Scaffold this motif. Structure first.
Motif, PDB file in Angstrom:
ATOM      1  N   UNK A  24       9.615  19.326   2.843  1.00 46.31           N
ATOM      2  CA  UNK A  24       8.351  19.535   3.595  1.00 46.31           C
ATOM      3  C   UNK A  24       7.328  18.479   3.226  1.00 46.31           C
ATOM      4  N   UNK A  25       7.727  17.217   3.220  1.00 49.82           N
ATOM      5  CA  UNK A  25       6.831  16.161   2.711  1.00 49.82           C
ATOM      6  C   UNK A  25       7.583  14.856   2.883  1.00 49.82           C
ATOM      7  N   UNK A  26       6.999  13.683   2.590  1.00 44.67           N
ATOM      8  CA  UNK A  26       7.768  12.473   2.439  1.00 44.67           C
ATOM      9  C   UNK A  26       7.974  12.231   0.979  1.00 44.67           C
ATOM     10  N   UNK A  27       8.676  11.155   0.664  1.00 37.03           N
ATOM     11  CA  UNK A  27       9.019  10.846  -0.745  1.00 37.03           C
ATOM     12  C   UNK A  27       7.764  10.723  -1.602  1.00 37.03           C
ATOM     13  N   UNK A  28       7.932  10.841  -2.916  1.00 37.92           N
ATOM     14  CA  UNK A  28       6.818  10.680  -3.891  1.00 37.92           C
ATOM     15  C   UNK A  28       5.902  11.874  -3.778  1.00 37.92           C
ATOM     16  N   UNK A  29       6.189  12.751  -2.822  1.00 30.76           N
ATOM     17  CA  UNK A  29       5.311  13.927  -2.595  1.00 30.76           C
ATOM     18  C   UNK A  29       5.361  14.925  -3.756  1.00 30.76           C
ATOM     19  N   UNK A  56       0.847  -1.185   0.000  1.00 32.44           N
ATOM     20  CA  UNK A  56       0.000   0.000   0.000  1.00 32.44           C
ATOM     21  C   UNK A  56       0.888   1.242   0.000  1.00 32.44           C
ATOM     22  N   UNK A  57       0.269   2.408  -0.181  1.00 34.41           N
ATOM     23  CA  UNK A  57       1.054   3.622  -0.379  1.00 34.41           C
ATOM     24  C   UNK A  57       1.988   3.880   0.800  1.00 34.41           C
ATOM     25  N   UNK A  58       1.445   3.956   2.009  1.00 31.65           N
ATOM     26  CA  UNK A  58       2.290   4.148   3.183  1.00 31.65           C
ATOM     27  C   UNK A  58       2.827   2.831   3.747  1.00 31.65           C
ATOM     28  N   UNK A  59       2.595   1.717   3.045  1.00 30.88           N
ATOM     29  CA  UNK A  59       3.315   0.469   3.259  1.00 30.88           C
ATOM     30  C   UNK A  59       4.661   0.467   2.555  1.00 30.88           C
ATOM     31  N   UNK A  60       4.708   0.968   1.315  1.00 28.65           N
ATOM     32  CA  UNK A  60       5.949   1.049   0.543  1.00 28.65           C
ATOM     33  C   UNK A  60       6.799   2.239   0.987  1.00 28.65           C
ATOM     34  N   UNK A  61       6.176   3.421   1.111  1.00 25.50           N
ATOM     35  CA  UNK A  61       6.841   4.578   1.694  1.00 25.50           C
ATOM     36  C   UNK A  61       7.403   4.235   3.061  1.00 25.50           C
ATOM     37  N   UNK A  62       6.749   3.319   3.776  1.00 25.71           N
ATOM     38  CA  UNK A  62       7.329   2.764   4.996  1.00 25.71           C
ATOM     39  C   UNK A  62       8.698   2.151   4.717  1.00 25.71           C
ATOM     40  N   UNK A  63       8.764   1.239   3.744  1.00 24.27           N
ATOM     41  CA  UNK A  63      10.016   0.548   3.459  1.00 24.27           C
ATOM     42  C   UNK A  63      10.975   1.420   2.652  1.00 24.27           C
ATOM     43  N   UNK A  64      10.454   2.187   1.689  1.00 28.49           N
ATOM     44  CA  UNK A  64      11.300   3.069   0.879  1.00 28.49           C
ATOM     45  C   UNK A  64      12.077   4.026   1.766  1.00 28.49           C
ATOM     46  N   UNK A 104      12.684   3.810   5.052  1.00 27.55           N
ATOM     47  CA  UNK A 104      13.686   3.127   5.857  1.00 27.55           C
ATOM     48  C   UNK A 104      14.822   2.597   4.997  1.00 27.55           C
ATOM     49  N   UNK A 105      14.541   2.272   3.727  1.00 28.33           N
ATOM     50  CA  UNK A 105      15.613   1.910   2.806  1.00 28.33           C
ATOM     51  C   UNK A 105      16.617   3.044   2.688  1.00 28.33           C
ATOM     52  N   UNK A 106      16.120   4.270   2.514  1.00 28.38           N
ATOM     53  CA  UNK A 106      16.991   5.436   2.451  1.00 28.38           C
ATOM     54  C   UNK A 106      17.807   5.588   3.730  1.00 28.38           C
ATOM     55  N   UNK A 107      17.168   5.452   4.886  1.00 33.20           N
ATOM     56  CA  UNK A 107      17.890   5.808   6.098  1.00 33.20           C
ATOM     57  C   UNK A 107      19.075   4.880   6.352  1.00 33.20           C
ATOM     58  N   UNK A 108      18.959   3.592   6.014  1.00 33.85           N
ATOM     59  CA  UNK A 108      20.111   2.704   6.166  1.00 33.85           C
ATOM     60  C   UNK A 108      21.144   2.985   5.082  1.00 33.85           C
ATOM     61  N   UNK A 109      20.684   3.318   3.876  1.00 36.49           N
ATOM     62  CA  UNK A 109      21.611   3.544   2.777  1.00 36.49           C
ATOM     63  C   UNK A 109      22.373   4.857   2.942  1.00 36.49           C
ATOM     64  N   UNK A 110      21.706   5.911   3.417  1.00 39.03           N
ATOM     65  CA  UNK A 110      22.307   7.242   3.412  1.00 39.03           C
ATOM     66  C   UNK A 110      22.161   8.038   4.712  1.00 39.03           C
ATOM     67  N   UNK A 111      21.302   7.646   5.663  1.00 38.96           N
ATOM     68  CA  UNK A 111      20.870   8.573   6.696  1.00 38.96           C
ATOM     69  C   UNK A 111      19.728   9.417   6.155  1.00 38.96           C
TER      70      UNK A 111
END
Ligand code: FAD
Ligand code: A1D7R
Length: 426
Positions: free
Chosen positions: A264-269, A236-244, A246-253
């Motif tokens: 001023x938003x989350x990704x895909x915004x 779902x939208x905030x199911x993938x944005x959930x993982x996307x 967290x994917x970023x935070x481990x990859x880059x911070x």
């Protein structure tokens, strides 16, 4: 005779391919001395939005035409010369160049009172010829008018160095030893900053609205190919944005420990910028993040945090405006200035006219351009028909209100589409 195609880049070629398959007569008019669109320019030293170090940021398999794979020697993200060579080979293989008038620039397109369109074209001499066509497909791209910020910060005329748009940016070596500020956090801006960072003495990245900085790759996969990873589509939208996210935070911070404004938003915004380099260039000192430019003090640039910096050049990576100078009336637009094209292609009130490639998707545009080309070719010869005009602008209304809801009244959300549900209706 039957169709005039304006443009022989990737969209106008898909159109000629689609017209050639249905046996539809067509000519393809193109200003450049060769097919290829923007990708042919960096390698010929032509003012265009590309630059000497431009590669794909989409997987080549999702980027090449489906019936015509790129050479298997090619990497996942080929350089612009490889892409330009590939597109020349497609036009050859598809028997299109017999239909392509190179060095031919369209100057006006006007709908005659009887149905056809009179197209005036400037040849290589400048010799204007005026021709008539039953139908016109527009595939001239939407990155051909620079968009400089307004107002240009004070002191612009004081400035000792050069102020330029990315349109005029060409190679990092054109600034060896100089001190350069890059303005923007777009795809042009991170690419140009990373390039300058290996030539200029000093490279400053002035960004005023934070964008999300996603690598070209998570889990070893291109992000445009993750987009159709079946395991990812059942998110779902905030199911993938959930993982996307967290994917970023481990990859880059997150962006806030690189001196970057976080958004001023989350990704895909609104939009995300793709880079493999810019965060590491920061962490090596090769690129210094900075807030918005506040003024030009003559020799230096002053940023809004109070800090100052000597600077020989400013490259504005602020993107492009969407214009159609050969269309006196303009591309169909609403007063908000939103594009009014049924299914992103067809004007509601102008039979015989079609716009192709005037969209901006998650990921690669090629499958969408192919879908659009195939549909247009069947509209040209009657295999496909359109709804009545009132019905067409009903779909434009639904698209547009949904656009203002999701991406907001930003500039260029009127052409935003997600590959999946869009291809799903062709
Ligand atoms: C820097 C940059 C990087 C990109 N990277 C990617 C990427 O990695 N992957 C991806 O999928 N997409 C990418 N894109 C999107 C890109 O627009 C498409 O890949 C592709 O170029 C679409 O080509 P086109 O045929 O729509 O337009 P263009 O490439 O702009 O071609 C349009 C043509 O119209 C011609 N023309 C002829 N006559 C006229 C006339 N009278 N007036 C105006 N034009 C005329 C122009 O000369 C031009 O060749 C990128 C875009 C930019 C700017
Ligand atoms: C976070 C995530 C999976 C995003 C998916 C995604 C978004 C955008 C792009 C682009 C931009 C392209 N140049 C264009 O604007 O057409 C290339 N690949 C992309 C992949």
């Amino acid at each position: 005779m039957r169709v005039c195609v304006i443009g022989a880049g990737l969209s106008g070629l898909a159109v000629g391919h689609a017209l050639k398959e249905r046996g539809i007569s067509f000519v393809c008019l193109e200003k450049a001395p060769d097919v290829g669109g923007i990708w042919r320019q960096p390698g010929a030293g032509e003012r265009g939005p590309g630059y000497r170090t431009l590669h794909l940021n989409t997987a080549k398999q999702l980027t090449g035409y489906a019936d015509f794979p790129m050479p298997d020697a090619y990497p996942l993200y080929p350089r612009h010369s490889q892409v330009a060579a590939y597109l020349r080979s497609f036009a050859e293989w598809a028997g299109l160049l017999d239909h392509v008038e190179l060095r031919t620039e369209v100057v006006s397109v006007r709908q005659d009172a009887d149905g056809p369109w009179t197209v005036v074209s400037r040849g290589a001499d400048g010799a204007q010829v005026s021709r008539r066509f039953e139908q016109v497909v527009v595939a001239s791209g939407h990155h051909n008018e620079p968009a400089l910020p307004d107002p240009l910060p004070a002191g612009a005329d004081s400035f000792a160095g050069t102020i330029l748009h990315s349109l005029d940016y060409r190679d990092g070596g054109d600034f060896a030893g100089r001190r350069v500020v890059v303005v923007g956090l777009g795809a042009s801006a991170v690419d140009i900053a990373a390039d300058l960072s290996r030539h200029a003495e000093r490279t400053l990245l002035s960004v005023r609205r934070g964008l999300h900085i996603v690598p070209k790759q998570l889990f070893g996969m291109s992000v445009d190919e993750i987009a159709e990873a079946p395991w990812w589509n059942e998110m779902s939208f905030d199911e993938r944005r959930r993982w996307v996210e967290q994917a970023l935070l481990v990859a880059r911070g997150r962006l806030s420990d690189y001196g970057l404004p976080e958004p001023d938003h989350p990704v895909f915004s609104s939009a995300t910028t793709l880079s493999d380099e810019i965060l590491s260039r920061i962490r090596h000192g090769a690129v210094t993040p900075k807030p918005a430019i506040a003024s030009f003090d003559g020799d230096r640039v002053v940023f809004t945090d109070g800090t100052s910096e000597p600077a020989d050049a400013v490259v504005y990576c602020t993107g492009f405006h969407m214009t159609f100078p050969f269309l006196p009336a303009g591309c169909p637009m609403s007063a908000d200035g939103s594009v009014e094209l049924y299914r992103r292609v067809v004007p509601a009130d102008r039979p015989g006219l079609y716009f192709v490639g005037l969209v901006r998707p998650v990921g690669a545009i090629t499958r969408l351009v192919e879908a659009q080309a195939e549909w247009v070719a069947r509209l040209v010869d009657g295999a496909a028909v359109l709804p009545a005009a009132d019905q067409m602008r009903e779909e434009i209304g639904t698209y547009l209100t949904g656009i203002v809801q999701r991406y907001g009244r930003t500039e260029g959300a009127s052409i935003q589409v997600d590959v999946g549900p869009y291809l799903a209706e062709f």
